[PDB]
Amino acid sequence: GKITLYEDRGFQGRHYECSSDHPNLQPYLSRCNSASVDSGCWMLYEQPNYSGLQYFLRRGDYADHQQWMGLSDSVRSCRLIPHSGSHRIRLYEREDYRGQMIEFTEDCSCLQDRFRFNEIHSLNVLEGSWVLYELSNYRGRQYLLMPGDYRRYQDWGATNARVGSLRRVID
């Protein structure tokens, strides 16, 4: 994978090139207002060491931070998400994998149209990486999910159990 981050809009300003995870961009970029993804699925993080607001980027060109749904021009770490050959996620009504349960292998622009709950209280990522979104149509806060058990919403770094849409990390 390969991404180029720019301090300014329209691929202008001081830039830096990443080919792997960087936990600390601070010495290199003071801000980030545009990015070009040559290859790979990337998660950008507001704070260093893969914390704070998260943003999913794919192959493509982002001329301003609003095109990756960025609330600000703050990018201080970035993650190259591993390839997954396949994708499967179970979502549960209640914590500790209890209550109603639905299993997705494909993207969902509106969870409430298939699973009539505004909140997901646990989920099991059986295959591949996913991005959860707070709102429908891939909007609101983003949360990267690696294969794993997630017994409560805190386990995927959210401050609430609200979930409106989710998408496979695929290029």
Author numbering: 1 to 171
Can you provide the manuscript's text about this entry?
In addition to these covalent modifications, the protein conformation is subtly different, with an overall r.m.s.d. of 0.23 Å for chain A and 0.21 Å for chain X. However, this is dwarfed by the 0.67 Å r.m.s.d. between chains A and X in the aged structure and 0.62 Å in the fresh structure. Aging of chain A leads to an expansion of the NTD and a contraction in the CTD. In contrast, the aged structure incurred a radiation dose of just 0.02 MGy. The presence of DTT-cysteine adducts at C41 and C108 are perhaps counter-intuitive, as C110 is implicated as the major site of protein cross-linking.
However, this halts further expression of HGD. In order to observe structural changes in HGD, we take advantage of an arginine-to-serine point mutation, R36S, first identified in congenital cataracts (HGDm).
